[PDB]
Design an enzyme around this catalytic site. Sequence first.
Site, mmCIF file in Angstrom:
data_model
loop_
_atom_site.group_PDB
_atom_site.id
_atom_site.type_symbol
_atom_site.label_atom_id
_atom_site.label_comp_id
_atom_site.label_asym_id
_atom_site.label_seq_id
_atom_site.Cartn_x
_atom_site.Cartn_y
_atom_site.Cartn_z
ATOM 1 N N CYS A 1 16.356 -2.946 -23.758
ATOM 2 C CA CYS A 1 16.383 -4.249 -24.412
ATOM 3 C C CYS A 1 17.395 -5.163 -23.733
ATOM 4 O O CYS A 1 18.548 -4.779 -23.514
ATOM 5 C CB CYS A 1 16.726 -4.076 -25.893
ATOM 6 S SG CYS A 1 16.882 -5.606 -26.825
ATOM 7 N N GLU A 2 16.969 -6.379 -23.386
ATOM 8 C CA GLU A 2 17.898 -7.277 -22.710
ATOM 9 C C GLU A 2 18.947 -7.828 -23.664
ATOM 10 O O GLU A 2 20.010 -8.273 -23.216
ATOM 11 C CB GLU A 2 17.171 -8.454 -22.063
ATOM 12 C CG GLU A 2 16.417 -9.337 -23.042
ATOM 13 C CD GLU A 2 15.852 -10.568 -22.367
ATOM 14 O OE1 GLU A 2 15.355 -11.477 -23.073
ATOM 15 O OE2 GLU A 2 15.917 -10.635 -21.120
ATOM 16 N N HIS A 3 18.652 -7.848 -24.963
ATOM 17 C CA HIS A 3 19.568 -8.417 -25.942
ATOM 18 C C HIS A 3 20.718 -7.472 -26.260
ATOM 19 O O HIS A 3 21.848 -7.923 -26.483
ATOM 20 C CB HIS A 3 18.804 -8.758 -27.221
ATOM 21 C CG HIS A 3 17.725 -9.779 -27.034
ATOM 22 N ND1 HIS A 3 16.620 -9.853 -27.856
ATOM 23 C CD2 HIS A 3 17.587 -10.775 -26.127
ATOM 24 C CE1 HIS A 3 15.849 -10.852 -27.463
ATOM 25 N NE2 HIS A 3 16.413 -11.428 -26.416
ATOM 26 N N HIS A 4 20.449 -6.163 -26.292
ATOM 27 C CA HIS A 4 21.435 -5.175 -26.708
ATOM 28 C C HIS A 4 21.687 -4.082 -25.679
ATOM 29 O O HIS A 4 22.532 -3.210 -25.926
ATOM 30 C CB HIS A 4 21.002 -4.530 -28.031
ATOM 31 C CG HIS A 4 20.809 -5.512 -29.143
ATOM 32 N ND1 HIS A 4 19.564 -5.938 -29.552
ATOM 33 C CD2 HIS A 4 21.705 -6.161 -29.924
ATOM 34 C CE1 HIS A 4 19.701 -6.805 -30.540
ATOM 35 N NE2 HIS A 4 20.989 -6.957 -30.785
ATOM 36 N N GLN B 1 9.542 -6.207 -24.928
ATOM 37 C CA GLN B 1 8.300 -5.454 -24.780
ATOM 38 C C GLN B 1 7.108 -6.367 -24.504
ATOM 39 O O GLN B 1 6.252 -6.035 -23.678
ATOM 40 C CB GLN B 1 8.039 -4.598 -26.019
ATOM 41 C CG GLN B 1 6.796 -3.737 -25.879
ATOM 42 C CD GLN B 1 6.640 -2.726 -26.991
ATOM 43 O OE1 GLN B 1 7.622 -2.285 -27.585
ATOM 44 N NE2 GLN B 1 5.400 -2.343 -27.277
ATOM 45 N N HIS C 1 11.626 1.312 -30.638
ATOM 46 C CA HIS C 1 12.826 0.508 -30.465
ATOM 47 C C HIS C 1 13.943 1.090 -31.315
ATOM 48 O O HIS C 1 13.724 1.486 -32.463
ATOM 49 C CB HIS C 1 12.573 -0.949 -30.839
ATOM 50 C CG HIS C 1 11.795 -1.699 -29.806
ATOM 51 N ND1 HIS C 1 12.381 -2.595 -28.938
ATOM 52 C CD2 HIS C 1 10.477 -1.687 -29.502
ATOM 53 C CE1 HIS C 1 11.455 -3.100 -28.141
ATOM 54 N NE2 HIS C 1 10.292 -2.568 -28.466
ATOM 55 N N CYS D 1 17.233 -0.440 -31.453
ATOM 56 C CA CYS D 1 18.323 -1.378 -31.698
ATOM 57 C C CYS D 1 18.619 -1.527 -33.184
ATOM 58 O O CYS D 1 19.768 -1.389 -33.615
ATOM 59 C CB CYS D 1 17.988 -2.734 -31.078
ATOM 60 S SG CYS D 1 17.793 -2.687 -29.291
#
Lengths: 190, 189, 187, 189, 188, 189, 189, 189, 189, 189
Positions: B77-80, B120, B148, B150
């Site tokens: 995940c690019e956010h986390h 995704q 996922h 996260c």
Amino acid sequence: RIRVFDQQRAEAAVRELLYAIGEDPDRDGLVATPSRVARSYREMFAGLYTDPDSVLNTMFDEDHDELVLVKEIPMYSTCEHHLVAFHGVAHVGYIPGDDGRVTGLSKIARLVDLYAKRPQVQERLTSQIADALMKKLDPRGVIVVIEAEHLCMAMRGVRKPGSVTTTSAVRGLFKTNAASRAEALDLILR
Amino acid sequence: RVFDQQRAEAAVRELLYAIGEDPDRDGLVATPSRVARSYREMFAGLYTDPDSVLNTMFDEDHDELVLVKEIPMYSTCEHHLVAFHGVAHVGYIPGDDGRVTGLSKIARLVDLYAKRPQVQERLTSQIADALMKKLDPRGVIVVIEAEHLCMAMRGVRKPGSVTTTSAVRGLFKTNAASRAEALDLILRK
Amino acid sequence: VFDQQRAEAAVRELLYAIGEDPDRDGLVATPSRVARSYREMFAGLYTDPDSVLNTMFDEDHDELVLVKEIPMYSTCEHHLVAFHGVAHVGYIPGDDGRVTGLSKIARLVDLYAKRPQVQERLTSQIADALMKKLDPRGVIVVIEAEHLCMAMRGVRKPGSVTTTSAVRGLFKTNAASRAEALDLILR
Amino acid sequence: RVFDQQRAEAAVRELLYAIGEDPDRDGLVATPSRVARSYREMFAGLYTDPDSVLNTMFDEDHDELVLVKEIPMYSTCEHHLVAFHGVAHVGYIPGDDGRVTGLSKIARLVDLYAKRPQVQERLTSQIADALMKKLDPRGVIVVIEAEHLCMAMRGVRKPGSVTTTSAVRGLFKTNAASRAEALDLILRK
Amino acid sequence: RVFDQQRAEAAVRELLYAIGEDPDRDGLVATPSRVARSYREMFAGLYTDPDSVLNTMFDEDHDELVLVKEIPMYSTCEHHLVAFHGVAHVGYIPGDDGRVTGLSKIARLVDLYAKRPQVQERLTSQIADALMKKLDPRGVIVVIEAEHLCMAMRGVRKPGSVTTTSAVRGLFKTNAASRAEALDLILR
Amino acid sequence: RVFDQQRAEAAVRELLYAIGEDPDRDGLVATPSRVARSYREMFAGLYTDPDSVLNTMFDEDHDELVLVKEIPMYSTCEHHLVAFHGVAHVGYIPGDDGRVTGLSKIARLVDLYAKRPQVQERLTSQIADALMKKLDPRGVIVVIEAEHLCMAMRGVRKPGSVTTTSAVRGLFKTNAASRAEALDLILRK
Amino acid sequence: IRVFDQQRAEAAVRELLYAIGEDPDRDGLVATPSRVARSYREMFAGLYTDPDSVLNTMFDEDHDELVLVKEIPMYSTCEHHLVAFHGVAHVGYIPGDDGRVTGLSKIARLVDLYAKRPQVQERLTSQIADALMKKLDPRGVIVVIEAEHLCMAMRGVRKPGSVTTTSAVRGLFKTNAASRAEALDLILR
Amino acid sequence: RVFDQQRAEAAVRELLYAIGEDPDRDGLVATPSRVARSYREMFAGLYTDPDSVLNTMFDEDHDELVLVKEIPMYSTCEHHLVAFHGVAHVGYIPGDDGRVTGLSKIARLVDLYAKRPQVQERLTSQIADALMKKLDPRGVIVVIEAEHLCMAMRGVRKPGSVTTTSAVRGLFKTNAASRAEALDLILRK
Amino acid sequence: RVFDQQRAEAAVRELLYAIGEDPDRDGLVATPSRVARSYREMFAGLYTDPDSVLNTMFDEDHDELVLVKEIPMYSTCEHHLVAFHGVAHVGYIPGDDGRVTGLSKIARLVDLYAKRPQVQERLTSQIADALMKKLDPRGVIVVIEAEHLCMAMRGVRKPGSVTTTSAVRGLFKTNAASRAEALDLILRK
Amino acid sequence: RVFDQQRAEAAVRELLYAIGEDPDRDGLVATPSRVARSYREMFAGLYTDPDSVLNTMFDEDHDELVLVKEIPMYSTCEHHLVAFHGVAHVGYIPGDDGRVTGLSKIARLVDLYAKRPQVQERLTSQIADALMKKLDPRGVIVVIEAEHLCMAMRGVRKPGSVTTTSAVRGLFKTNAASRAEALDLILRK
Ligand SMILES: [Cl-]
Ligand SMILES: [Cl-]
Ligand SMILES: [Cl-]
Ligand SMILES: [Zn+2]
Ligand SMILES: [Zn+2]
Ligand SMILES: [Zn+2]
Ligand SMILES: [Zn+2]
Ligand SMILES: [Zn+2]
Ligand SMILES: [Zn+2]
Ligand SMILES: [Zn+2]
Ligand SMILES: [Zn+2]
Ligand SMILES: [Zn+2]
Ligand SMILES: [Zn+2]
């Protein structure tokens, strides 16, 4: 030992990590990422900041002395060698002592969560949960089983995806009695 | 995009200090180096063009669908910067010229797009676009079923939830009956 | 406030009324234990269930959040007899992404359930509280509980399960969204 | 034992005050009277002798096991006055005299012993003892499968967990094969 | 080995005349060219060293068995030049250094040894030897389950018969219990 | 057609040298001769007329469908000279005269048309046409389920793929109800 | 005025044994006239007690939805052949505005007493339905009996184990087809 | 023996008066005659010699066990005149002479012994003994699996309990291995 | 031996007269000729040498067991002239020379020995002996699983019984482990 | 329609000469006498009237379908004198008079029509016609599922094929729903 989470220090490290891997921290999908990653690490390592043992409460079962079984406990942990998640479930079974000491299901779940939310290896995690339950509940026996998926080598195409690592820890009566461990394990698998 | 190994190790050591651990203790004295090497592989897609892995071959005998299922898919995940992992399913209808590619090459294409800071839906769309561009097929369909982690770690979602995303191009995008049939083949095991 | 001394006296008087001997070995501790059981059985009267919910944000996904097999133990207000089962809570996060912990939703169900209750009121109360706190696009609540009031009497079949549902927001306006959520919940 | 309704009602109103509720509000005015009546049936076993329900009949043809299953069983924990409910299974081998009894009469004996301040283990033994006393059979076996709510309410044990208790008398206690066979029949659906 | 195209193609056109066919009809017009290409892919193992494909990686976390199953396996009988096809199963226990290799790399190693004039027993032993050499593991086990067409083609055997071969090295060879366990995982 | 062993053997030895191997090793000492022999049996259909194998019989009892299933079928793709193998299913309705034939003869006909440089559809059509010619039946149906290896060997398609072909003649061609049932009969295992 | 004559019944059975050619005085039949007479007293007990008076008075204060009773023991005798037909009964009633209900044992006794007569299964089912209507004054009643008849199995005419099913609907269930569908589905499940 | 119809009908009319019914009502006016006809078929074994039904035949090919299973068996308990019904299994080893008999003949022998006032154990022994006498076998084995209703009628037992009885003569009695395999064969479906 | 059509047809017409039928009715006029025709094929093994059908081929690849299962087997009991039909299973271990034979040729050998007045054990031994003589293998195993109709037709045996016979030669006779394994593969279909 | 055993034995001996056998060898010495004896039982239907086997009985309780299934059926093709064997299913709806018959008698009627030179389709129709006349029912349905060996013997059809024939009379022919329901019950195991 309770530790210190430095938000600003973590965010600076994450931004440096993005530069190191060749990414552009200023692009729109990564602007808030150093902040979001630091927040995720606070929760991912929450066990370092609260004592896991202190979550358990005191209660007494006056009717029964039979096995208390807690199943499908969410378990999310991080490999200490690669800082990569390994996730699955935990199963905790304890036989109340003479005093009838018990604890809430939600409290056992939180204890597992806090021990798992640390730089961990699955075997250490299983033993730590069992040891704390023995210390706090003074039970006749404790059993801990963790069924987790490790991602470190699957990500590097070295092992089949979906493989499940299973670990167990037995204390007290489950350790001395082979019949008792076998029966408890069967209940966990079914 | 050039991977600076010393910079990555220094950042990881700073990260270990930030979370309150001692980087010099025995269980973490090798962690900064191991994490940097892992990051090299986790983001391998940033260093090689995924589209270039595909090879050129022609199937002159056949007109049927080429379907590839349970392609290992490991992404971040690019956010986390937390892993989401599962499988990918790629189906393409070869064009009139019969252009095809090796199964392993499609697996390498998926792996390289997945080995990046990703979302995704973006990953599925990128895989579909690359197959259309390189193979010039009549149609392409891509499906990713990934777990996922996260929000599950933060006790917000039940563990084990599987997110499904799809991308359709060419024939599968224009024709709804074909998309429905292709989706059925991918979902049924 | 819970007046324990008053409760113990009431339970002991109750044992005399039914013909039992309060001095017998299985009943001497019963007045104190029953009072404690009532403190927890009506714990919802002493804590606001809505206050347990925390504030969190899901930055990645906006799909349905589904929480299942939530323990539900409640008491019929008409007969003070337990009805017990599970609850299922599903909500669609709003634009802001507001969400809450699974354990927090579980405690919310427990606290509303730990009251003199009728199952339909309980289902709506849980659904309404989630709407208030999360400001979500939609909420769905399903309770599957076994009622004992008439089974305790000789009027009803043992094991019968009462099912109640409450839909808010998107699930009420969209029939497809409600239908899909139910299939996952029951299976 | 004699049931006093007004005394029970006064206690229930006192309990509602103790828990902080207002008994005079509209949703609870009738509740103290309903609770007193429910207690009359919930402890009906205290007011009628369970053993007298059994009738006299003789089986002249066969000497094999008489097995009665899924007998409704509703009882109350004596420690917390909380219901535990399930089923009972009664099996007896008639003696030389062939004495037997009706299924419905056995059901009433289980019901009357269960409608008391009870502990499941005592309930199982009492049922077995009465059948032993009255039928003079070669053996008796009683099995109760009930769900207990006292600790599940306090989130200490898993909801839905089933407690199983058994009592064996006469031949079922002396013969391990007989106990094993009867238990197998009882557990099968 | 060194492959010569026109020499193969001339043989193929010569072959069509020998079998009584007409090479000039439309079904066989492009057959001589495609057959030469098919031999290039069928014997690709003769032109690249199978052992060189494996890469170097280390697993510091685990000590367990690495098992890879249903590796596509397509080979050719050396006596009749007729295909026998199936799957391969490779299991190795990493050594003390933790040396491991990618699954796709093991899959390609199997393919290149299989893409030769082969007999199944030789193929299994060659794969096991290569893994022992490169990974220096504690043990290696290879199992191949393939369908042979040579004798079914000559109406001598029932169609669908599956030939099974195994090769064990290191720990699996010295330990009978370990071999039995590793085998049980493969057949299930 | 006639089979020249010496011409084939010269080509085979030339082919083995072409791929770079050593003919003097024991695996290739006798292979050059066997390839000529294997091609003789693999293409035996070119040397015997498939239609002449059928024998003469009449069924005086029945006029219903005669169905023959799991006929061994081994053939070779003519474009790549690579085997595709499976089973054949032949069903015919005897004509007014009641004409029928032996199962072994049907198996040999399929074998002889199959033992040629072939394309699966052409093989299915040839078998169906031959049966119509020899039996003069009311209807014929032919189904071939074979595994093709050409593209699986080149890692382009999934291993295990099954190609299915059908040919319907006469009554099965005119009547949809009879064709639908016959197809059902062939697929059931 | 009805009365059971023990001695008259025994005399009839002894005459019955003579009529069939048996010897009533042999040891296997000395006690048969008395045992059969005792069985007839229990089998026709419904003629001597009014089935309707057994029902008691209770009120459901919580819910007004259907009360369903399943697997009620049902033993009756065909009036035409004096042969038993046995099975189960299912009783479902919707309480009225007053909420009136009754005990499971009380409903079981009403079914048993109507069944313990010379009966025909459909008339038995209808009588149970009407009695429930009159006694409970419910909105609706549904009664279903699933019984095994032995009359023709004894006469080697029909296969043993066949089940005759009968239904009777009153009040709301007779007027509303949807209500019948749910209730009927509940009984068969 | 012979069946006195008028005597049987008079007994039934006396029985109806004894139990308090009115024999003249419409449901019971024809009951006495219908019951007499039912007794005629129910006790037909008393009127036909079971031994005379068997015919004479020789098995020239084989000497292995002849096994007969699921033979209809319908009988009447002599103590209560209540049916018990099930199946019978007869297996015999032909003697040196090879004597055998028809399956329908064993079925009639089983039926005629069963169509009497019977107890299951006596019924099994009588069948085995008759087969021994007539067939000159080396051994005979008989198994009866029947459902008894006597105690179910008096609400003592759940319906559907199955009683199993066996009788072994000759070789099956002397050889434990031979009986053990045969018993396994008879019980398995 | 040579079939005598006219003698066979005359005998069949005599047989129809003997059994009381009318040979001149429409369903029997052609029966004598049709029966003679069926007998020529039914006893075709008597007119052609079974051993001569086997051909010579060599397996250079493998040394494993060659196993053939579900070979159609139709024969006639010599004692009653009634068919017994099933399947045959032939397994041989080729010698070092690799001598083998075609599946169709093994089927014809079984067919020709089976198409005679036979007893199943003689048929099994004859097939095993013929394979040993022609192939000179290390070992041979023959198993026949057939349904006999001789005793079923005379209502002496249950229909559907399967007689199993086996014959072992060479290695399978000397080695019990090898024989045991081969047998297990054949029984497990 | 006498049975001339001596004439039949002479024909069988002539048949053995015709096929090339030696009637005097020990395996065929007794065959002509054994075949004649088997023929007396195999064609027993020609010597006794099948319709007379049914007895007179009445079902006064019910008028729903009486279904008799898995009736043993052994018959002989009239064209080839080869057995075809299977089962028969008979279902009849009693008329207003309630006329019925025993299951064994239906089995006997099926047996005798089957114990003739037959074609299955005539056999099905004859059974239905006989029941129609004797019982005067509202409807009759007969289904025969048998295995034919004539062409399987001549390797023309697959072994094990099952021919199914049906006959409907009265109510089953006029009402398609009644026929559909009865057919479904018969095919259901
Ligand atoms: Cl006490
Ligand atoms: Cl149970
Ligand atoms: Cl496998
Ligand atoms: Zn790791
Ligand atoms: Zn994320
Ligand atoms: Zn209530
Ligand atoms: Zn309690
Ligand atoms: Zn080969
Ligand atoms: Zn091809
Ligand atoms: Zn009747
Ligand atoms: Zn009895
Ligand atoms: Zn015979
Ligand atoms: Zn025929």
